[PDB]
Design a protein around this ligand. Structure first.
Ligand SMILES: Nc1ncnc2c1ncn2[C@@H]1O[C@H](COP(=O)(O)OP(=O)(O)OP(=O)(O)O)[C@@H](O)[C@H]1O
Ligand SMILES: Nc1ncnc2c1ncn2[C@@H]1O[C@H](COP(=O)(O)OP(=O)(O)O)[C@@H](O)[C@H]1O
Ligand SMILES: [Mg+2]
Ligand SMILES: [Mg+2]
Ligand SMILES: [Zn+2]
Lengths: 390, 310, 403
């Protein structure tokens, strides 16, 4: 399922990161030059593939939404914070000087006695931290976490021990606030990244909820799991009786006592249930009375991917203004609108993008998302309160 | 099993399997046997285990662990190999790989004595503190589980406690420090501790693998040695000087404790049978007493060298 | 249900390269010529006039099931389906070469400082989703069954061992239930292949989430291409769970399975998906297609779709005293009593022909059309009259016509 990378140990420059096999085998901490060049991607746009037929030129232009990424200012901060909380979560879990063997020995009692606060050692602390990500839908919470966590090898294998360190794991919450289906998504996502059978032996034996909350966090320490990511934490709002608080108590006992870092993602509708929090917003055209440099760069880098024969290199201010007007800042809407306009231009035969064409494409093919964009356009808090997720 | 712990330094493989069970929360012994082995008809054995070969396959990715290394360094094989012979030793090594517990025990002498001598768990007060200080865990160790001596080689005495291997025949049990010790005075005999410290280096010695003198070699070696001591009448034993020397070296209470009480009046005895032609391989402990009573200027490895030479 | 042995082709798109799944599919016809393979007509409607009265009447009632006329809106839908089937395969490339050695070399080079940055394996993002919403009687199922019929369903690959199921069509449940739309998947994968799955994966111990994570393994074990769910309007107001236990179920299902999802529904089902930005973003993932009845005139000139749809249907007549050319009054009466809906055009023509054949007056006239409409088509009167009024909320009283 996942490729096992044999570990080679570098020389870290931090006193605390002294002799851990876990954090001296991770890729080196990048710098500001590599915080904005290890994420960039764009379509090739070969000049040989512009004179081809309409069908080829219309199938090769739909790959823009998947293969285009431009790191903004917020991604730098997110990458730095994830790096810190994934490198600092192992110092209290040293496997050399008998510190991880003191975290696995305690966790056997919690499986036996069923209580998640029965320490056997008092000298084994926890050093993990927590993060909370909240932003409007379409802001980029997942596709900018699958390119910032994609520079780490996931399953690593250390042969000095027999440990198979899983650097990061990603699961998502149940469609309701279920109790035994959050501790089963963990197993279903852990045994398809290792090729093992953990779901078929943890859960099929008719266990209670407490035993399945203890076995999950014990097997998350048998493999030195570095970061646990839970997507769509807003699914706990419609929980069962007491599920909206028992799981949020577990998610603060896991980072504080057991020591596994945890990161949570949700739409601003998930602020009601409540952890350092990061808030994301759609790009604003005006920052200090002048057009935003990030927005200008985003637009002028997207405009250089065009398969239309009668393309215009120069981007008009009116075209940019109407693009922002019809998009209202959400990057998903921006990219999708550009792609749809390009496809409709190829279909008609007129191969130059116009403001009128943009408006027609919007009005004809963005019907469901109309009221949310209009609410954000109006900017009245009373209209914003219903939908638009801002 | 996707993550099998490497054995610590000088450990029994039984403790390794028990810790493998601990590290993943496999409380049910049947589930542990299913996951580690695949069959529910295995016996948890301390000293001369079987089914190695599926244990050495879990550690196959680690280059340094092979079947011979577990057989020699993490099981109590070096205490039987030099004495049984050559063909029996090779057959036993071949049978430790496969799934036969009975044949492995039959090939070896006291393994075929069909009694589990002091099957209760042992531990040493001071050793557990050192292991907690250095490794952070507490494991069973080959030093504690000597075949007949209930004593740690370096410290005084082994503090016993209840429960045993045969109470549950399909469960591996791992020591927890919460039962660290109980403070009650116990004193150990000096010569018995000396015997433990004399026999301990045989465990950690590479030369014990290939030095297994044959039966006629043993009897001829003892015959010439007894002739050199000068206590040997023409094709006869004095039966008095040897008893006097062993009684001076080891007291009566010791011989009671290790279950080799002398019967000089009885013609058949553990000490008497050594002088005559050897019929079957004698236990390591009898040879240890003979060596320590006769000549203390040579170690166990030196004695093995002298026996193997001629 | 018949296995077609794979025959590999080469396509001009660079992003597909050497992909067995993309290359085994039929070649990329242009969308203009993709509306010339849908057309059909009743075979051998000639020299049958002097046959009988009963055979000549049973051979007319096959007009609705054997006549298809492509319109202007059947180009865009076909192109979107063609892009969506093949664009969901580029991530799932099975013929991977040597990845271990390359990744390990990159890791060592970045760890020794020679290579400054390196990118390891990545995870595929959310699957493309489309929502088609049109008033009932416009042909939302006939169009799909005549567009997906050009793609073989089950293709067998020789070098691999995967029976690539190119598409799958299931339907929603009337309860509004969520364990009865995760089980139609197995019951519809059993009628395309031969093996059984409802016996194994269709138990009652497994919850909805577990049934949603076992329809993800058998969704990439066979390289399934599209999943079509029909009549999505049935999920509103179900007794199983609330309105927020399924608006999340779609989000989770789209986020797991990874195969493109197509949803066909009624304008009553728009209100289900226009509830929050998440569901409207995912539902309109690759555009939202909205279908309308044919208008007789556009701007100030007569439409060229209605004329092409009428003048060709008129050439399937089996009346002895057939009229050579169609009259403007007849066309206007047909439009006024039809309103553009497809099933109240072909059926109003077949029924009128049967009436004219039974009465013995072998001619189609406006009065006969009005008589048959007022007599036999009573249940369609109110919504057609509402369309004649055109008032949206008056139409909204009924629950399946466009509002
Ligand atoms: N910074 C960005 N640059 C370019 N494209 C982006 C960026 N952020 C997001 N996108 C685009 O947005 C698309 C959809 O957004 P994404 O999947 O990240 O949303 P999300 O945060 O998971 O939403 P939801 O609220 O539904 O969970 C991606 O496929 C990607 O192409
Ligand atoms: N483009 C078309 N040309 C000719 N007949 C059509 C067309 N579209 C639909 N029909 C007719 O409409 C009838 C009903 O279509 P149907 O498949 O029921 O669509 P829906 O399920 O949306 O009502 C079919 O019998 C078909 O003959
Ligand atoms: Mg997401
Ligand atoms: Mg239908
Ligand atoms: Zn000791």
């Amino acid at each position: 399922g996942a490729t096992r990378i044999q570990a080679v140990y570098r020389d870290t420059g931090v006193e605390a990161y002294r002799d851990n096999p876990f954090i001296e085998a991770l890729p080196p901490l990048q710098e500001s030059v590599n915080s904005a060049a290890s994420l960039k991607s764009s379509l090739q746009l070969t000049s040989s593939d512009l004179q081809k037929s309409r069908v080829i030129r219309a199938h090769t232009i739909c790959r823009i939404p998947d293969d285009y990424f431009q790191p903004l200012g917020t991604h730098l901060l997110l990458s730095e914070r994830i790096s810190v909380m994934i490198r600092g979560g192992y110092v209290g879990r040293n496997p050399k000087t008998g510190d991880l063997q003191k975290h696995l020995q305690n966790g056997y009692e919690r499986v036996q006695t069923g209580e998640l606060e029965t320490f056997r050692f008092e000298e084994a602390r926890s050093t993990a931290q927590s993060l909370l990500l909240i932003g409007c839908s379409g802001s980029g919470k997942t596709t900018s976490l699958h390119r910032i966590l994609a520079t780490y090898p996931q399953v690593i294998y250390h042969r000095e021990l027999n440990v198979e360190q899983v650097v990061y794991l990603k699961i998502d919450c149940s469609h309701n606030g279920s109790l035994k289906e959050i501790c089963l998504n963990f197993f279903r996502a852990l045994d398809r990244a290792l090729g093992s059978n953990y779901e078929r032996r943890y859960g099929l034996k008719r266990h209670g909820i407490e035993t399945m909350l203890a076995l999950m966090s014990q097997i998350a320490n048998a493999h030195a799991l570095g970061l646990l990511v839970i997507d769509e934490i807003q699914h706990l709002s419609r929980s069962r009786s007491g599920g909206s608080q028992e799981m949020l108590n577990f998610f603060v006992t896991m980072v504080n006592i057991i020591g596994v870092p945890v990161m949570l993602i949700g739409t601003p509708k998930a602020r009601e249930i409540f952890f350092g929090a990061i808030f994301w917003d759609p790009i604003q055209q005006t920052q200090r009375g002048k057009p935003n440099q990030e927005w200008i760069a985003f637009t002028d880098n997207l405009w250089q991917l065009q398969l239309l024969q009668r393309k215009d290199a120069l981007l008009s201010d009116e075209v940019r203004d109407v693009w922002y007007e019809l998009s209202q800042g959400v990057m998903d809407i921006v990219v999708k609108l550009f792609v749809l306009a390009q496809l409709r231009a190829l279909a008609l035969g007129n191969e130059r993008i116009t403001a009128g064409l943009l408006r027609q494409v919007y009005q004809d093919e963005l019907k469901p998302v109309h009221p949310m964009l209009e609410a954000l356009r109006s900017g009245i808090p009373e209209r914003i309160a219903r939908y638009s997720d801002l | 099993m996707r993550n099998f712990p490497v054995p610590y330094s000088n450990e029994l493989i039984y403790s390794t399997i028990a810790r493998a069970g601990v590290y993943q929360g496999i409380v049910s012994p049947k589930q542990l046997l299913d996951e580690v082995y695949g069959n529910r008809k295995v016996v948890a054995t301390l000293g001369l285990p079987s089914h190695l070969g599926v244990i050495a396959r879990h550690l196959h990715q680690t280059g340094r662990y092979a079947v011979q290394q577990l057989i020699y360094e993490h099981t109590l094989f070096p205490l039987y190999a030099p004495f049984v012979g050559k063909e029996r030793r090779d057959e036993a090594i071949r049978l430790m790989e496969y799934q036969a517990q009975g044949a492995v025990h039959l090939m070896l002498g006291v393994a075929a004595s069909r009694v589990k001598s002091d099957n209760r768990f042992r531990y040493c007060p001071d050793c557990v503190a050192l292991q907690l200080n250095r490794y952070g865990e507490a494991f069973w160790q080959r030093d504690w589980y000597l075949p007949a001596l209930p004593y740690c080689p370096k410290h005084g005495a082994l503090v016993f406690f209840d429960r045993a291997v045969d109470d549950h025949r399909h469960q591996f049990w791992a020591l927890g420090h919460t039962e660290l010790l109980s403070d009650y005075p116990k004193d150990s005999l000096s010569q018995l501790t000396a015997l433990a410290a004399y026999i301990a280096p045989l465990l950690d010695a590479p030369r014990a693998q290939e030095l297994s003198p044959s039966l006629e070699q043993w009897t001829l070696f003892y015959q010439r040695l007894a002739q050199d001591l000068g206590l040997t009448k023409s094709k006869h034993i004095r039966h008095d000087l040897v008893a006097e020397r062993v009684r001076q070296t080891f007291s009566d209470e010791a011989l009671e404790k290790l279950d080799l009480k002398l019967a000089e009046n009885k013609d058949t005895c553990w000490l008497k049978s050594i002088f005559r032609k050897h019929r079957k391989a004698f236990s390591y402990l009898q040879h240890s007493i003979v060596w320590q009573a006769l000549l203390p200027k040579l170690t166990v490895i030196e004695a093995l060298q002298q026996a193997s030479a001629l």
